[PDB]
Amino acid sequence: DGVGSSSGNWHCDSTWLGDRVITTSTRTWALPTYNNHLYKQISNGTSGGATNDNTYFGYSTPWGYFDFNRFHCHFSPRDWQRLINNNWGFRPKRLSFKLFNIQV
Amino acid sequence: DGVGSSSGNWHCDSTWLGDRVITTSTRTWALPTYNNHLYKQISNGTSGGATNDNTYFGYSTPWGYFDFNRFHCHFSPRDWQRLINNNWGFRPKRLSFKLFNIQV
Amino acid sequence: DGVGSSSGNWHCDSTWLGDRVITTSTRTWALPTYNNHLYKQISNGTSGGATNDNTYFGYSTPWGYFDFNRFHCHFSPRDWQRLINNNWGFRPKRLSFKLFNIQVKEVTQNEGTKTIANNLTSTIQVFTDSEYQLPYVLGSAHQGCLPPFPADVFMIPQYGYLTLNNGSQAVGRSSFYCLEYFPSQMLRTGNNFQFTYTFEDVPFHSSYAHSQSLDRLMNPLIDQYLYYLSRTQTTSNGRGVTLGFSQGGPNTMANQAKNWLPGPCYRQQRVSTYPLQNNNSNFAWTAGTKYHLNGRNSLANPGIAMATHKDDEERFFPSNGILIFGKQNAARDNADYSDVMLTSEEEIKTTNPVATEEYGIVADNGQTQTTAPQIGTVNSQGALPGMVWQNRDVYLQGPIWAKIPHTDGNFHPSPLMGGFGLKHPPPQILIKNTPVPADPRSTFNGDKLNSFITQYSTGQVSVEIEWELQKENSKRWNPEIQYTSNYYKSTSVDFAVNTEGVYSEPRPIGTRYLTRNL
């Protein structure tokens, strides 16, 4: 696996087998540099126009994170229709995650 | 099997298994005597007010017959909904027929 | 098995073996034709004199059902006495059901004379809903049970159900059910039907009272090492501010630190048994304790389990907060107080709050030098960490089980009329006479047949339940309280027939006599 070979393939599909369904999604992402590689103290307080309800103290990092935690990530509108018209219930079982074809 | 034992049970159900569905129906019937046990020549002709298009010649018998040849015989409205929303096609395969608990 | 042989025997017995008891009952029933073999839409709406609270939409079927869900179905008064005096708890285990010796009869009218004949070739049809696919209508405390007294013959009740409504009308989610769309068994006079059922694990009903109260659990002889705030103000000289602190002890027990809390509260309005002490007005509905569901008000009857009254208050009861049984031959509507039998939950004072009183007091405000403390009264209290409570008691006249609704969540799913909550209760049993057409016309017509022979059926039914017992193990020195029969002379015997042959039950009998430490 060098610079001239791809490290993965595009998988977007859904498979309905009996009592289970498997969804798979592929997307393209872009990751910037955040903060200029720095950790930074952040805060908000009542000294400004902020009311006491909105105050906070924390940190922003130079890191990104992945979020797949919405349903439209995993279901097409037609797949969601098959689910809700035919079934009394559903729950998640297991997941797989891949990150591939990286270029800097 | 005498006069005091029933010769069958009531079966109305539908079963959805994979690539097939099985329907079963039970009804209660009544059979009269027709024609006074006679065969009879019947006809219609243009001598009366009948036009030539409506003429016929035939016979009526003293017999009845069973007709299950409509779909609502075999499907409830909810079963018909499951069929037409989820499937691209269907065809019949085999049938069974029973006639039981007769009383004259 | 022909027309000349019986398909079962009469079994009424009880057997006490060790840690279990088995009851078995047999009764004679009669099943009419309902609705003229028709399903019918039924509804009630505000267009008439009905208020919005009473509206409904539903269907009545042409089917009957069996109901054994009261305790007097399975226990004689003497058997119930053996149970409640000797045991700390019991629960159901398994049951058997039989339906046998069926006979179908046809009745025909000619002028004013009535004759009844046997119809030997007719059938009835029976099934159990074991997949819980029908609206479950048991557990609503309806009439039509197997009678408490084994010699009585009973009529089978008609089945029906309700769906969603808006006023007197149906909405899009309303469901219709045909019971002929279920496989069922057909029986002529020589056939019979049976099935068996197993109860799921359920906790024992607690038959006992506590001999301690939740606030008395301390040693009366010893001080606590913890302190409380006993003094905000100086007594000596003038009135001034100070902080005093004391340890809790034998004379201060109301002030001591404790580990636990009484159960939840939903307050009821108070009603005296002596009518002259009640206010003069009709407050039964307007002062009733209610809940509000989809714009529609429902009386909370009986509600959560609370003590009926406190010490020496025995003349008061919560308005809609108790179970009320009628005496024999009592009126349906507007019966007098001497016609009915009021239960009492008084045994649970040691733990649950009293139904007609507040839960407690909380702080309304924060205080300052210029502002005096304000206190609120808590009339409704949900679950708090550290609460303990008892369920409502069960009675010989009362229900046994209820079906737990199928839902995302629930809290302490014990039925509020009392009993055992069940995710999969004993299945309901549907029974119907098969329609027999009258002679039709001799020329074909395509309309459905509306003319039938009039029929009804009778037969025998047996039910057998195995019960598991929890034995009482106690070091109490002094004798217990027991349920007993009155010693003195009387015009008749309690729990027997009178001169006319009528069986009556004099009083309601609860389960809680033996005691246990709290």
Q: Are B71 and B92 in contact (CB under 8 A)?
A: no
50-89 in B: which are within 8 Å (CB) of C?
A: 76
- From C437's Cα to the closest Cα of chain B, the distance in A is 7
Host H or E run for residue C317: strand C316-318
Instruction: Return the structure tokens found at C319.
Output: 């308005």
Host H or E run for residue A86: helix A77-86
Please, is A41 exposed, middle or buried when counting C-beta atoms within 10 Å of its C-beta (0-12, 13-18, 19+)? exposed
Q: Are C57 and C168 in contact (CB under 8 A)?
A: yes
Taking CA atoms, C243 is separated from B42, C170, C236, C251, C255, in Å, by 117, 67, 14, 21, 16
Note the residue count of chain C: 518
Contacts 24+ apart (CB under 8 A), A12-19: A14/A75, A14/A76, A14/A79, A16/A82
Does B48 touch chain C if contact means CB atoms closer than 8 Å?
A: no
Does C1 touch chain B if contact means CB atoms closer than 8 Å?
A: yes
Taking CA atoms, C473 is separated from C86, C91, C514, in Å, by 10, 18, 10
| Chains in contact with chain B (at least 3 beta-carbon pairs closer than 8 A) | C
B with C: touching (≥3 Cβ pairs within 8 Å): yes
Which of B3, B26, B32 is the closest to C441 by Cβ? B32
Q: How many CB atoms sit inside 10 A of residue C27's CB?
A: 23
Place of tokens 């009386």: C299
* Cα–Cα distance for residue pair C90/C517, rounded to 1 Å: 18
Which of C187, C435, C439 is the closest to B6 by Cβ? C187
Does C131 touch chain B if contact means CB atoms closer than 8 Å?
A: no
Omega before residue C302 within 30° of 0, cis: yes
Cβ–Cβ gap B10/C189 under 8 Å:
no
* Cα–Cα distance for residue pair B26/B6, rounded to 1 Å: 15
Q: How many CB atoms sit inside 10 A of residue B103's CB?
A: 10
**For B29, which residue in chain C has the nearest alpha carbon?**
C437
Instruction: Return the structure tokens found at B64.
Output: 């009845």
Indicate the residue type of C190.
Answer: G
Indicate the residue type of A87.
Answer: N
For C319-423, strand residue ranges (E) read 324-326, 340-342, 360-363, 375-378, 380-381, 387-388, 401-403, 420-422
- From C184's Cα to the closest Cα of chain B, the distance in A is 5
Which of C188, C190, C440 is the closest to B30 by Cβ? C440
Chosen for mutation from C180, C193, C449 (greatest number of chain B CBs closer than 10 Å) is: C180
* Cα–Cα distance for residue pair C245/B101, rounded to 1 Å: 90
Cβ–Cβ gap C186/B10 under 8 Å:
yes
Cβ–Cβ gap B101/C185 under 8 Å:
no
Q: Give this entry's resolution in angstroms.
A: 2.5
Cβ–Cβ gap C436/B26 under 8 Å:
no
Cβ–Cβ gap B9/C190 under 8 Å:
no
* Beta-strand relationship, C153-155 and C20-32: parallel
Q: Can you state the percent helix, strand and coil of chain B, rounding each to 5?
A: 15, 20, 65
Q: Are C61 and C158 in contact (CB under 8 A)?
A: yes
Cβ–Cβ gap C184/B28 under 8 Å:
no
Q: Are C335 and C326 in contact (CB under 8 A)?
A: yes
C with A: touching (≥3 Cβ pairs within 8 Å): no
Host H or E run for residue C99: strand C87-110
Taking CA atoms, C483 is separated from C212, C488, C494, C512, in Å, by 21, 15, 13, 9
Cβ–Cβ gap C3/B8 under 8 Å:
no
Instruction: Return the structure tokens found at C151.
Output: 């010699």
Which of C125, C183, C191 is the closest to B5 by Cβ? C191
DSSP lists the bridge partners of residue A56 as: A44
Experimental determination technique: cryo-EM
| B chain contacts of residue C434, beta-carbon cutoff 8 Å | 28
Contacts 24+ apart (CB under 8 A), C378-387: C378/C265, C379/C265, C379/C267, C380/C265, C380/C266, C380/C267, C381/C264, C381/C265, C382/C264, C383/C264, C383/C411, C384/C261, C384/C264, C386/C259, C386/C260, C386/C261, C387/C260, C387/C261, C387/C262, C387/C263, C387/C264
Q: Are C45 and C168 in contact (CB under 8 A)?
A: yes
- What does the angle CA B85 – CA B89 – CA B91 come to, to the nearest 5 degrees? 125
Place of tokens 């243009």: B46
Which of B3, B8, B28 is the closest to C435 by Cβ? B28
Does C434 touch chain B if contact means CB atoms closer than 8 Å?
A: yes
Instruction: In chain C, count H helices and then E strands.
Output: 1, 32
* Cα–Cα distance for residue pair C22/C54, rounded to 1 Å: 42
Q: Are C472 and C298 in contact (CB under 8 A)?
A: no
Does C335 touch chain B if contact means CB atoms closer than 8 Å?
A: no
Helices (H), chain B: 77-86
* Cα–Cα distance for residue pair C214/C386, rounded to 1 Å: 12
DSSP lists the bridge partners of residue C271 as: C317
Does B11 touch chain C if contact means CB atoms closer than 8 Å?
A: yes
Host H or E run for residue A77: helix A77-86
Return the sign of the alpha-carbon dihedral for residues C309, C274, C488, C72.
negative
Indicate the residue type of A42.
Answer: I
* Cα–Cα distance for residue pair C458/C101, rounded to 1 Å: 8
